[PDB]
Amino acid sequence: SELKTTLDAGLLHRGNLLQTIGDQFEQWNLLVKREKSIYHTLNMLSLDVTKKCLVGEGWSPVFATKQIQDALERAAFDSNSQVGAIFQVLHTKESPPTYFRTNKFTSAFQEIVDAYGVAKYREANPGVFTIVTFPFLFAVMFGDWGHGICLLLGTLVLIVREKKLASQKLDDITDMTFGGRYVILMMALFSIYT
Amino acid sequence: MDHAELTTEQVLKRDIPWETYMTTKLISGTGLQLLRRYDNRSESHRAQLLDDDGPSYVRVFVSILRDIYKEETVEYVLALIDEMLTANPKRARLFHDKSLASEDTYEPFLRLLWKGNWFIQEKSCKILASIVSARPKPQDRIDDVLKLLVEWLCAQLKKPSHPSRGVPVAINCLAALLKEPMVRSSFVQADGVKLLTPLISPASTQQSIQLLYETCLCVWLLSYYEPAVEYLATTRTLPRLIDVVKSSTKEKVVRVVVLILRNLLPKGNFAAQMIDLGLPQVVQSLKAQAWSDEDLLEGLNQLEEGLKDNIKRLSSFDKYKQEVLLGHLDWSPMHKDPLFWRDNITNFEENDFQILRVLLTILDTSSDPRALAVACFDLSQFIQYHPAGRVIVTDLKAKERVMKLMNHENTEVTKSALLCIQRLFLGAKY
Amino acid sequence: GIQQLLAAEQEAQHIVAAARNAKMARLRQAKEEAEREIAEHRAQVER
Amino acid sequence: NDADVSKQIQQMVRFIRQEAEEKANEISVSAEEEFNIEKLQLVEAEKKKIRQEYERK
Amino acid sequence: PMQLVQIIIPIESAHLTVSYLGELGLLQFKDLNSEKSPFQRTYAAQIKKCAEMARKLRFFKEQMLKAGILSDLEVKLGDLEAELVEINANGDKLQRAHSELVEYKLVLQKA
Numbered sequence: 001s002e003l004k005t006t007l008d009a010g011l012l013h014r015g016n017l018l019q020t021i022g023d024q025f026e027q028w029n030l031l032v033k034r035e036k037s038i039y040h041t042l043n044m045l046s047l048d049v050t051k052k053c054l055v056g057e058g059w060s061p062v063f064a065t066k067q068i069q070d071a072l073e074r075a076a077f078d079s080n081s082q083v084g085a086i087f088q089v090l091h092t093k094e095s096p097p098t099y100f101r102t103n104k105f106t107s108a109f110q111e112i113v114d115a116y117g118v119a120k121y122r123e124a125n126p127g128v129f130t131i132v133t134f135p136f137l138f139a140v141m142f143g144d145w146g147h148g149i150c151l152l153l154g155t156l157v158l159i160v161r162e163k164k165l166a167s168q169k170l171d172d173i174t175d176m177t178f179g180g181r182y183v184i185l186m187m188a189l190f191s192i193y194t
Numbered sequence: 195m196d197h198a199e200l201t202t203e204q205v206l207k208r209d210i211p212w213e214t215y216m217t218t219k220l221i222s223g224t225g226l227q228l229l230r231r232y233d234n235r236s237e238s239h240r241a242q243l244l245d246d247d248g249p250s251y252v253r254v255f256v257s258i259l260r261d262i263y264k265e266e267t268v269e270y271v272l273a274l275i276d277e278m279l280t281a282n283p284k285r286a287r288l289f290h291d292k293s294l295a296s297e298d299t300y301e302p303f304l305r306l307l308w309k310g311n312w313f314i315q316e317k318s319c320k321i322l323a324s325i326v327s328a329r330p331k332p333q334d335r336i337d338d339v340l341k342l343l344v345e346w347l348c349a350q351l352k353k354p355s356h357p358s359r360g361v362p363v364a365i366n367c368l369a370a371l372l373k374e375p376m377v378r379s380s381f382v383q384a385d386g387v388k389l390l391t392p393l394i395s396p397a398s399t400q401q402s403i404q405l406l407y408e409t410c411l412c413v414w415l416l417s418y419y420e421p422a423v424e425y426l427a428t429t430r431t432l433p434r435l436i437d438v439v440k441s442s443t444k445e446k447v448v449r450v451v452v453l454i455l456r457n458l459l460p461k462g463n464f465a466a467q468m469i470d471l472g473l474p475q476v477v478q479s480l481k482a483q484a485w486s487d488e489d490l491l492e493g494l495n496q497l498e499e500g501l502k503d504n505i506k507r508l509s510s511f512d513k514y515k516q517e518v519l520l521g522h523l524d525w526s527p528m529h530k531d532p533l534f535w536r537d538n539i540t541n542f543e544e545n546d547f548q549i550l551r552v553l554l555t556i557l558d559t560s561s562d563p564r565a566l567a568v569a570c571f572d573l574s575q576f577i578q579y580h581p582a583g584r585v586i587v588t589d590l591k592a593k594e595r596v597m598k599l600m601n602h603e604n605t606e607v608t609k610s611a612l613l614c615i616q617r618l619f620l621g622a623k624y
Numbered sequence: 625g626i627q628q629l630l631a632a633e634q635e636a637q638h639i640v641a642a643a644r645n646a647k648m649a650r651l652r653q654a655k656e657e658a659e660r661e662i663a664e665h666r667a668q669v670e671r
Numbered sequence: 672n673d674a675d676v677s678k679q680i681q682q683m684v685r686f687i688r689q690e691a692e693e694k695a696n697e698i699s700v701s702a703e704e705e706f707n708i709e710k711l712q713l714v715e716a717e718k719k720k721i722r723q724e725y726e727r728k
Numbered sequence: 729p730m731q732l733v734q735i736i737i738p739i740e741s742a743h744l745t746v747s748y749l750g751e752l753g754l755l756q757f758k759d760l761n762s763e764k765s766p767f768q769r770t771y772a773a774q775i776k777k778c779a780e781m782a783r784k785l786r787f788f789k790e791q792m793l794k795a796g797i798l799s800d801l802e803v804k805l806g807d808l809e810a811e812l813v814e815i816n817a818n819g820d821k822l823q824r825a826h827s828e829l830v831e832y833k834l835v836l837q838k839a
Contacts, residue, residue: 001826010819017808021792021797021812022798024808028785029799034747035781036779040775041757042769043761044757044759045757047742051686054739054770055734056734058757059756065754065755076741076748080400080740082400085736085738086674088734091732121730414704444689446693482777628679632683636686639695642699662714662718662721678735682736682738685740
């Protein structure tokens with residue numbers, strides 16, 4: 001009985017400690033992710049001891065580079081360093097991969113269309129036309145104004161519950177369906193019109 | 195430096211018309227003219243007036259300073275003497291007259307700790323103080339040196355008014371003097387070492403780095419002089435400086451901290467640092483984070499290797515040898531301590547605690563009657579720790595010696611004997 | 625840029641090399657310097 | 672140019688000030704003081720022998 | 729329309745600059761230094777130490793999850809994990825002692 005009481009007390013103390021240990025590990029997960037990102041940057045990008053700085057080059061959006069580099073330099077200066085980071089541009093004959101900016105609703109359609117590939121930094125983007133073309137064609141194959149209402153209603157609940165849906169996980173097929181709620185709603189509206 | 199320039203600016207900007215002060219009687223006329231001529235010395239350089247770079251302008255300035263008690267004139271003059279001394283452009287001839295004759299260097303000691311404390315330091319301070327002590331070794335015109343140390347303590351009391359100047363001038367002067375060991379002894383008498391130690395322990399930012407170097411350059415000078423080192427060892431924040439070094443981004447600051455720590459390692463000092471302060475673990479982390487010169491990182495590893503060498507010395511094997519090879523059993527601090535026995539149990543095993551069995555035979559028969567009492571103490575400790583050993587001790591002739599000791603005079607032998615019997619006994623019946 | 629940054633680096637390296645050379649000189653010059661001082665002390669005792 | 676030429680001089684200035692003025696100067700000065708003490712100790716032994724010599728005389 | 733950007737982040741704030749850049753994120757990392765392997769490389773040895781710390785933190789998190797917990801920093805996490813492991817070992821030893829004593833009590837009562 002004494003040994004069991006001691007074991008119970010030790011287990012209770014361990015659980016009480018783990019209650020805060022898990023809370024600390026919650027933020028430690030993001031800390032470890034940031035450390036891993038910095039480690040990948042260090043192992044991938046070299047540095048100059050003569051410059052006593054980490055230097056390199058990489059692709060960046062011109063619009064983003066208009067403010068991101070300045071913000072990084074300002075943060076480096078605010079980090080009590082003797083001098084902030086650089087913001088110089090670089091040029092090369094190679095064509096870096098690039099992605100067009102994705103909106104909150106256009107993201108799903110853009111991802112669906114991009115499953116065939118990508119293009120140059122500012123080349124043709126068939127996603128712009130197909131964002132409405134696919135609803136403009138998939139409606140005909142299912143044109144019946146008694147079921148399109150049902151499809152829209154089913155999509156509508158997903159859009160409404162999006163606040164809770166974004167947090168709670170679901171089935172893999174269910175998650176894939178919820179990923180394109182706006183596209184599903186647009187297709188349902190087109191089908192209702194058809 | 196930047197600290198000296200900010201002071202030197204405050205004085206040379208504000209103008210002081212000596213001749214008017216002289217007419218009103220605070221000095222005689224020869225002095226004011228002489229100070230005006232010193233300002234013109236830089237201008238004559240251009241005009242090739244070799245007399246501007248004169249030394250003969252020096253005499254009145256010496257006269258003027260001691261006689262006058264009006265802070266404005268002596269401060270403006272001191273700045274102009276100060277600027278001249280170090281320049282190679284102008285005020286070359288100036289330095290000669292001072293250096294040849296120790297009398298000006300005694301007049302300098304009267305000038306030292308005179309006028310506003312902040313005003314005197316900004317005007318000259320370390321610029322001319324050091325050489326004056328070199329020109330007159332006694333520098334007692336070292337009671338005067340003690341007065342200068344008191345003035346430095348007063349400047350430290352007003353750290354807020356001129357932290358990046360008044361403290362910096364004192365640090366630069368102490369470093370310049372500490373080059374000579376006798377002048378380092380003068381610095382040892384001077385206070386404010388603890389204030390530098392607190393500044394060294396915690397760094398506000400790059401601003402801390404500005405005097406950071408000087409404060410610990412003095413620590414390097416303190417490493418040179420043992421007397422200052424003993425005061426520094428007593429002084430707090432020496433461990434705190436190491437803790438900051440663990441968190442220091444600058445590799446050079448950590449390397450500078452290591453140098454002092456590298457020089458202060460001793461058998462006792464290594465022990466205090468390792469046990470309490472957990473130096474080696476921080477040192478291992480610093481060794482792991484190799485930075486800048488490999489030789490600088492290697493020096494930190496060598497300091498850690500030196501601490502490990504002290505640890506071997508700390509783990510002396512003399513105690514085991516004294517009991518058997520010497521054959522003399524004396525109590526000592528580790529033979530009344532349980533911890534040593536715990537690490538010694540394993541070393542004995544060579545044929546069933548063969549060293550312990552020989553020790554049990556030594557307990558049974560010993561050259562000295564006094565040895566039997568400490569021997570019984572030693573046995574007791576191993577048996578308590580090793581329950582199997584306790585049963586063996588009762589079988590061993592050591593228990594027979596303990597039985598004879600129980601039937602024996604001398605209170606101390608009987609105490610130890612009783613403790614031996616009990617140690618075997620606890621284990622026989624459970 | 626890179627060439628401009630390299631000028632500062634080589635300069636700092638030269639200053640460190642000079643510091644290394646100077647350290648050896650300070651110790652070597654010292655052995656001659658106070659050997660005469662020891663003789664001066666011996667002379668002071670002789671007087 | 673512009674930001675690039677500004678940053679390039681700033682990094683270079685930091686390299687020159689810290690690596691050389693702050694560290695190289697310390698290296699020479701610290702070594703000199705240690706050497707000065709080392710010579711003084713070597714002189715002391717000769718002085719002790721000379722002191723022992725005058726007493727014998 | 730992206731483009732190349734070349735910059736230098738001083739070692740005095742290289743970690744801070746990397747953290748600030750990762751707060752928002754604009755430019756993908758390069759791959760010039762990747763040919764040197766996790767063996768030293770530019771800072772892969774430091775990356776190796778960070779990876780070891782992350783592995784220790786992951787082991788601690790897995791232990792906490794096994795315990796039903798709810799979710800210098802690396803050193804603190806390792807110390808907490810060691811303390812939890814010691815507490816669990818003490819509890820297991822006490823439970824084993826209780827089981828042995830209960831078995832002995834049952835045997836003695838039957839006898």
